[PDB]
Amino acid sequence: SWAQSRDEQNLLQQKRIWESPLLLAAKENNVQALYKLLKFEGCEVHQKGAMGETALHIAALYDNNEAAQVLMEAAPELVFEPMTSELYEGQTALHIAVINQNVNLVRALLARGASVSARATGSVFHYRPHNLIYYGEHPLSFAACVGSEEIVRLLIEHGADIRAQDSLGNTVLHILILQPNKTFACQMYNLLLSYDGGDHLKSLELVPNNQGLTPFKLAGVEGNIVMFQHLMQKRKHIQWTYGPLTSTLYDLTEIDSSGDDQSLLELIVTTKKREARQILDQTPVKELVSLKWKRYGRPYFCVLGAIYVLYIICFTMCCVYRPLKPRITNRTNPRDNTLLQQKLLQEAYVTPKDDLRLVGELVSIVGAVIILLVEIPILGGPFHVIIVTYAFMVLVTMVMRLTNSDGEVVPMSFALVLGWCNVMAFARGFQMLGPFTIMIQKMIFGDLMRFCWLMAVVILGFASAFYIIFQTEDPDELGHFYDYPMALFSTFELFLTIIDGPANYDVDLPFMYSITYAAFAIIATLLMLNLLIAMMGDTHWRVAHERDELWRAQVVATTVMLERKLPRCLWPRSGICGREYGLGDRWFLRVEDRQD
């Protein structure tokens, strides 16, 4: 394991500190023990420890400016020494002094001429979940994350480049977005901005991440509202103040779907960050998408819904009327219990009333490949993998067609439950019953699978037990379960109280039926009542707000995909462009509000 390797190496490091009297005197800050170990007896001052550290590195882990200065006066070359381990590859003595905010040592290390651009590419300095913090690689990134504004400027004064990026291409601004202390990071964020070039171009706030993210755009996908609101002040214009009213004009550039995929809107939808959903409730974004859905969002959705409901109600019209035959097969040849009148007609005759059937089938088959075409190239959708697999079923039904298989029904019967139950996805948005469907959507594809095993397991015993009892009995009277699958099915219906239970009084029931079914009834009811109380965890207030906050996000989810895949002839661009206006050729939204 990797988690224990750093546990062992930390214990292994403390051994070498205790064994080496130099590293011990540099940990314990034993000043008089350093002179007797360097001036009188010439000990190895370049003594590398278990982590590739030096005596000065240990003199810095524990703030010991006295031991650090003795090690820097008798060996000034220790200042340039980086750690040479796998976990701490590249960390210098300045990194340790900046993290500990030892301003006296950082200023005394910078007087010794320490490197202000030493990358710390150790495996413990990575942006991984197993690492508690992530400050970056440069000594300037460390000063900015610890909030030590004195060291931030003290490092800039010695030639610190704010443009510097780490192995992930993150500037000193991208890292500040990924910090807990957000209220203090905005102050530090402005401190780093005051050292920019000053010109309007090649600014630091525009350097893109290696995954295509500016510091403004990274704050949106990550869900940093304190940095989102702070970075929004730099890109919004206040038109006028008229008493309480103040019509502010937001920039709207990286916020709208201007680029093919660099847009911030396209990032909030497709991200795994649960917290990023709260960005769209900010005032530059909420009234934007509010205007995107009321008009040109909801109508085109319903058209796609009315077409779909019309398409499915015509596809089902082709099912209720299918070929027919009074069973060309001879008699009940297999078993006497056979109720079959096989409906197989291979000939394309019956020309009167069958010509209309080909129209619906052609519509159903071109309307299905169209669904494949638009989907040839989960947050708020699930239901529409079902439509894609449905059109696969009508194609398999088409393969089952013109071959006249016995199972012409099975993919067809599959097809229309999916197609109608898919209409339920249109209830999203529309009205309040959308939040009801997504509670279902969360429950169907979420805990139904994991909960059914528990029921299947409890059903397993009682269902199989019943089969043992009635295997003796003649199934003519009370043949509720005569086969093993029939034993599990009749008990499955009995677990949901959709069957009256084995109730035969003309005969006498076996001894173990009344004992098992009494236990089964009581167990099956206690399973359902504790299940309802288990649903009360999603009942207090936040969950009613959580099912509503992700529904309104599920609507914005469906809204932006339409715009990307609908033609731009319809659906004009949001805002009023900055050309033919005293603006900078941007698009910009007018938003007026009132205060108290």
Ligand X SMILES: C[C@@H]1NC(=O)N[C@@H]1CCCCCC(=O)O
Q: Does 380 bind ligand FZ4 (CB under 6 A)?
A: yes
Q: Does 261 bind ligand FZ4 (CB under 6 A)?
A: no
Q: Which CB, 8 or 500, lies closer to Ca ion?
A: 500
Q: Is 499 exposed, middle or buried (0-12, 13-18, 19+ CB in 10 A)?
A: middle
- Least Å from the CB of residue 557 to ligand FZ4: 4
Find all residues with CB under 8 Å of 54, minimum gap 6, and list them: 46, 47, 48, 71, 78, 81, 83, 93
Helix (H) or strand (E) holding 21: helix 21-27
Task: Look at residues 83, 87, 92, 118 and name the one whose alpha carbon lies nearest to residue 4.
Answer: 87
Residue with tokens 């019967």: 413
Tell the smallest beta-carbon distance from residue 559 to ligand FZ4 (Å).
8
Is residue 427 within 8 Å of 433, Cβ to Cβ? yes
Candidates 486, 504, 490; CA nearest to 337 is 486
- Separation CA 135–CA 142 (nearest Å): 6
**Are 560 and 265 in contact, with CB atoms under 8 Å apart?**
yes
379: left (phi over 0), alpha (psi -120 to 50) or beta: left
- Note whether 498 binds Ca ion by CB under 5 A: no
When asked if residue 471 is in the footprint of a second copy (CB under 8 A), the reply is: yes
Task: Please give the structure tokens belonging to residue 233.
Answer: 């002040």
Where on the chain is the footprint of ligand X (CB under 6 A)?
13, 51, 53, 57-58, 61, 88, 124, 131, 133, 240, 242, 245
Calpha distance 465→457 (Å, rounded)? 13
Whether the Cβ atoms of residue 14 and residue 51 lie closer than 8 Å to each other: no
Each residue 220-259 as x (binds a second copy by CB under 8 A) or -, in order, gives: -------------------xxxxxxx-x-x----------
Measured from each CB, the residue nearest to ligand X is 242
What lies within 8 Å, CB to CB, of 221 at 6+ separation is: 213, 264, 267, 268, 271, 273, 276
**Region at 122 (left for phi over 0; alpha for psi -120 to 50; beta for the rest):** beta
Draw the binding track, 329-368, toward ligand FZ4 (x: CB under 6 A; -: no contact). ----------------------------------------
With contacts defined by CB under 6 A, name the span among 150-158, 220-228, 439-447, 558-566 that binds ligand FZ4. Answer: 558-566
Q: Is 442 in the site for ligand FZ4 (CB under 6 A)?
A: no
Quick one: 20 or 170, whose CB is closer to a second copy? 20
For position 525 contacting a second copy by CB under 8 A, the verdict is yes
Residue with Cβ nearer a second copy (40 or 511): 511
Q: Which residues contact 573 (CB under 8 A, 6 or more apart)?
A: 256, 587
The entry of a second copy, ligand X, ligand FZ4, none near residue 86 (CB within 5 to 8 angstroms by kind) is none
Residue of 103, 226, 388, 439 that binds a second copy (CB under 8 A):
439
Q: Quick one: what does residue 175 bind among Ca ion, ligand FZ4, a second copy, none, with the CB cut-off 5 to 8 Å set by partner type?
A: none
568 binds, among a second copy, ligand X, Ca ion, none (CB under 5 to 8 A by kind): none
Q: Which of 36, 544, 564, 573 binds a second copy (CB under 8 A)?
A: 544
Q: How far is the CB of 454 from a second copy (least distance, A)?
A: 6
Task: Quote the least distance from Cβ 507 to a second copy, whole Å.
Answer: 4
Query: Which amino acid would we find at residue 57?
Result: H
Q: Scan for tokens 């009188």, then name that residue.
A: 40
Stretch that binds Ca ion, among 238-246, 319-327, 342-350, 499-507 (CB under 5 A): 499-507
- In one-letter notation, the amino acid at residue 1 is S
Question: Do the beta carbons of residue 555 and residue 428 sit within 8 Å?
Answer: yes
Of the candidates 22, 13, 146, the one whose C-alpha atom is nearest the C-alpha of residue 83 is 13
| Residue whose CB is less far from ligand X, 242 or 511 | 242
Q: Which is nearer to a second copy, 202 or 325 (CB)?
A: 325
Residues 167-196 that bind a second copy (CB under 8 A): 180-181
- The residue of the chain with the least Cβ separation from ligand FZ4 equals 384
How far apart (Å, rounded) are the C-alpha atoms in residues 460 and 483? 14
Between 57 and 174, CB nearer to ligand X:
57
Q: Which is nearer to a second copy, 228 or 517 (CB)?
A: 517
Residue 184 contacts residue 148 (beta carbons within 8 Å)? no
The residue count for binding ligand FZ4 (CB under 6 A) is 9
DSSP label at residue 422? G
Pick one of ligand X, ligand FZ4, a second copy, none as the site partner of residue 561 (Cβ within 5 to 8 A by kind): ligand FZ4
Known binding residue 500? Answer is yes
- The shares of helix, strand and coil residues in the chain, as percent rounded to the nearest 5, are 55, 5, 40
Question: How far is 222 from 182, CA to CA, in rounded Å?
Answer: 13
Question: If you search the block for the tokens 């035959």, which residue do you land on?
Answer: 325
Q: Which does 51 bind (CB under 5 to 8 A by kind): a second copy, Ca ion, ligand X, none?
A: ligand X
Using an 8 Å Cβ cutoff, are 159 and 123 in contact?
A: no
Count interface residues toward a second copy (CB under 8 A).
151
Check binding of 381 to ligand FZ4 (CB under 6 A): yes
In the complex, least distance from residue 299 CB atom to ligand FZ4, rounded to whole angstroms? 13
Residue 244, binding choice from ligand X, ligand FZ4, a second copy, none, Cβ under 5 to 8 Å by partner class = a second copy
Residue numbers in the known binding site for Ca(2+) are 500
> Residues in the site for ligand FZ4, rule: CB under 6 A?
304, 375, 380-381, 384, 557-558, 561-562
